[PDB]
Design a protein around this nucleic acid. Sequence first.
RNA 1: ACGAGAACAUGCGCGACAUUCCGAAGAACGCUGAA
Lengths: 200, 203, 214, 135, 123, 123
Amino acid sequence: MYSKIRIVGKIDVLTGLHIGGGGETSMIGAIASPVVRDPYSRLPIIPGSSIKGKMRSLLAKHIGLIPGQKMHNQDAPEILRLFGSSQKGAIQSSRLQISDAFFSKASQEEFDKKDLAYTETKFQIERVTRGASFDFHIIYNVENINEVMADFENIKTAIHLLENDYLGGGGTRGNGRIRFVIDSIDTVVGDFDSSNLSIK
Amino acid sequence: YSKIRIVGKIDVLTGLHIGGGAIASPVVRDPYSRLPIIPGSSIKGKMRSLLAKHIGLIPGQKMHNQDAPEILRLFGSSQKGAIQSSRLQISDAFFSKASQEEFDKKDLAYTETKFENTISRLTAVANPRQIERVTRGASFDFHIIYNVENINEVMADFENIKTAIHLLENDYLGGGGTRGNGRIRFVIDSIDTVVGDFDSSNL
Amino acid sequence: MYSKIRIVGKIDVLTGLHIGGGGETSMIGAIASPVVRDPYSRLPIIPGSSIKGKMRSLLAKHIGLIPGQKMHNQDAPEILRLFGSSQKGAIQSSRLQISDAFFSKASQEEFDKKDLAYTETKFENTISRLTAVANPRQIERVTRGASFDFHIIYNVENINEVMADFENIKTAIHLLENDYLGGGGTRGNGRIRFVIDSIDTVVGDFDSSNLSIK
Amino acid sequence: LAKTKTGEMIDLNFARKVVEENKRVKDNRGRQEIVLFNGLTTSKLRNLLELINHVYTKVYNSDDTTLSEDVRDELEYLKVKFAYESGREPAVRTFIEKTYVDKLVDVVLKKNTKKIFLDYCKYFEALVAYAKFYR
Amino acid sequence: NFARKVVEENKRVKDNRGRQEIVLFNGLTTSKLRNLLELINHVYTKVYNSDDTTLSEDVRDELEYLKVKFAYESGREPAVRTFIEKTYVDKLVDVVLKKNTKKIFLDYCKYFEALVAYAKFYR
Amino acid sequence: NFARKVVEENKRVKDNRGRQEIVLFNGLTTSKLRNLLELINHVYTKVYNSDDTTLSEDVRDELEYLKVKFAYESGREPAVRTFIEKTYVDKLVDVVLKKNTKKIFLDYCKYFEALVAYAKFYR
RNA sequence: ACGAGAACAUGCGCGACAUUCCGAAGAACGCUGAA
C-alpha cells in the first residue's frame, strides 16, 4: 500500500530571516538585497527548495560526509532514499516532498495590527520580521513499510539541526534563526499508522 | 455505451513547472495564447503512476502496460492480443479566463522566475539557476471523459478515479515537485453524462 | 431523384491534433511522428478516412457490436446502411462520404498574424516502471487555435430512412466531440468541436432544412 | 498626476528637465563639481527615498485600491518632515520647491488611490535616479 | 546589422596575467544588462500576449519606468551607461513611444536582443 | 557535395575516451540545432506560401533575425559555433539576403537539409 | 459497316494502442553602522 503521510505545521522566525531572490519593484529601497516574495500575495515566502537543501546538507554533514565528493548523489544511502537520487543506474524517487512555506494568515493579521511591516531593513539588507510565521506542509511517500520510522527519525534529526542553525542569508551574522512547531502528522492517504510519528 | 464528463478546476497551491522546449528553464505554454498550460499527458501519467503505486506492483513492468488489471481497464493497455481501450481520456488544462482576468487586474505576470543557487559540497560555490514557474493561485479548467465500456464496472472505476485524484492532490504535477513545485488542488464542477443514458447523478 | 445533401462546416481543434503520416520537410526534425500534411500547401490536414473511421467506430460501439466480430461488415444494419458495406452478395453503398478537412484559410491568416507556426512540437517522456528513467519523446501537433474546413455528402437512397440516418449522424458527431480525433487522444490530443456552417441539399429535390446533426 | 504652474504636466521627462535645470558646473580648483538642488548630497536624497519607501511598503501591505487611513497620516507626516528638512538645509529647500512634492502628495491625498500615489512616487524615483545619473 | 557593428566597435581584447578578456567594456556583464532585459521581457510579454496593434497606456507607463531604470543603472554601473550611450537604447525607446504601435516595439525588442546576443557571441 | 565534404572533414571519433563514439563538430547534435532549424522551417513555410520570385520584406526581416539567432546559438554552445563557422551557413544567409530571390533561399534550404542529413548519416 | 459493341480497377478500412520533460540542485559565502 503506497500510503502518503502529511506533516503540516508552522515555522516561526527568531531573527531577521533573509532568503534572496532576483526581482525588482516600484519604490524599491537602496538596500543591496531584497527578500524572495510570493508574486501573488507580495508577501515574503520561504521556498521549499531552501528547506530541503538546508536539511539535506545538514544531514550530510552530521551523519558524516565522504571526502572528495563532487556530486550530491554521493551522500549516505539513507539521504538518497529520503531526498532523492539521480545517480545513473540507481535512480531513487524522493520520499520527501517539501512545499513552499507561505506567510501564515495569523501572522499576517498580527502584522496588520500595530502597523508592523512584514520586512525590515538592517544596516543594507532586507530581513523578515521576527514575529512572522510561515505554514509548512511536507509529504512523506511510504515506499518501504519498515523504513518509515527510520526515515521519520532522520527527518526529526534534520529538523532539530535546522532549529539550531540558520536558513539562508548571513546566518553566521545573525540572519536566519527559526523554530519548527508541528500541528498534526496524519496518514492522509492509505492505511499506515502515523499516530506514533513525530518529527520533533 | 455512454460518455460521462468530469469538468472542473485545478488550482496551483504552489508554483507549477512543466518543462517544454538567461536560464529561462521554460514552462509548457499553449502556442496560440502563449499562456501556461498543464498537458493532459502529464495529468494522466501522474495519475496512472500514483494509482499503480497504490495498487500492487509486479517486479518489473518494463512494458509499462502490465500493471494491475484495474489500471489497464481505466488508462488503457497495449499488450499483444489484448488491447483495452482507455476509458479515461484526460485533456490539456488551459489557463482559466477567470484567473487570467484576476492576474491582469493586478500587475502580476503569469510566470515567475525562481532562483536556486545549487551550492556544491567540496567547493561550496553556488551555481546560479533560474526556473520558470506558474504563479500561485492560477487556475486551469480541466475536462475528463470516461466511457462506460461495461455498466457494472463504472462504480469501481470511479472509485479508482477518486482515489487517483486524492493521491494527486497530495502529490505534485511535473517539475521539481520534491522541493516545492507543481502542487495542485482539484475542485469538481459537474460530473454529468453527456452522451448516453447512464445515471451519473450518484457519481 | 438522386438527392445529395451537403454538410459543410468547421472542425475546431480544442487541443493539439496529431494525425500521423509519412512526412517530409526541410531540416527533418528528430520527431519520428510528423503530422499528415497536404503536400501542395504543406499545411496539416485531417484525412477524411480518419473522420469516417472514428465516427463509424463510435457509432457502432454506441449501437452495440455483435460479440466475436471479425469484420466491419458484421456491424449493425444502420451502421452498414450509413457508412457502406462490402459483404459478399449484400453490398450496400456508403451514403456518407467524408472528404478530407483542409487547414482553414481563417486559421492560416490568424497564424500568419501573431507570427505563429501552424504546428507545434510537444515534448513528452515515459517514466519507466523499473529504472524510473525518462525517455524523451517529441510529437508534432496542430495548435489549438487551428480550424479545418470539413465537407460531407449524404446520399439519399431511401427517403423514409433519412431522418433516422441523420439521428445516427448526430449521435456520431456528438460522440466524436466528446471523444477525440485521430491521435494520442487518451492523453489529451485530438480534442475536436464541429461547427456546422450549412446543411443544404446540393443535388435533388429533397429538402434538409429541418435536418440537423448538432 | 498633477499639473505644474504655467501649464507644465508632471511626467518623468519633466523630472529629467527639472534635474537638468538644477545642475551646474561648480568648477572648483579647476575641477567641476556636479551640484544638484544647490548641492544636495546623495545621503539626504536617499533618506528622503527611504521616507517615501516607508509609505510605499505600508501601502503595499494593503490590497485595497484606495489609500489607507494610516497611509494618509504617514503622508501628512511626510509633508511635515519635508517642511522641516527644507527649513534645515537650503539644498533640501531647493529640492522641495523645485519638485513640488508637498503639492503632489496633497493631490494624491485628494485623489485617494494607490495608482496616483505610485505615479507620484515614480516621479520622485525618476528625480533621484536622474540626480544620481547626472552626478 | 547595427547591433553587430556597435558591439564590435565596443569590443576590446584586454590582456591580464596572460589571460584574455574579450569584453566590450571592463564592467559589462550579462546580469547588469539582464535586469533591464527582465523588464523588457515583462513589457514584451504584455504587448505580445495582449495582441493590440497600438501600444497600451500601461505599456507606455512601463516604458517611462524603463527610462527611469536606464537612468538608475546608469547611476550605479558606469559600464551600463557607456553601453547605453554607445547603443542609444533610450532614443529607440523614445521613437517607440512616438510611433505608439506594437510593430516598432517588436523591432526595438529584436534590436535589444540582437545587442545582447552579439555581446554573448563575442564574449 | 559540399555538405558531405564538410561533415566528413569535421567528422571525428572519441579516441581519447577509449570507447567508440562518433563526434561531429566537436559534439554537435540535432538537439543543439533544433531551434535554428525550426526557425528555418518557419521561413521556408513562409516563402513557400508566398507566390513571388523575390523574397518579401517579412522574409528579409525574418532572415536578419535568423542571423541574430545564429550568433546567439554560436554564443550559447561551442558545437553550434564550430558547425556555423565550418559550414559558413551564416555567410550563406548574408549571400541569400544579397541575392533576394526565392530560388536562392530554396537552394540555401537544400544546402542546410543536406548538412543535417549527412550529419545524421555519419553519426 | 474498325476482333467489334456495353462494361467505374470498385466495394469495407481511424497511421491507430500503451508513454509524467521527469529523477537532484539552499540565491549563495566570508562583509562592524562606523574613523
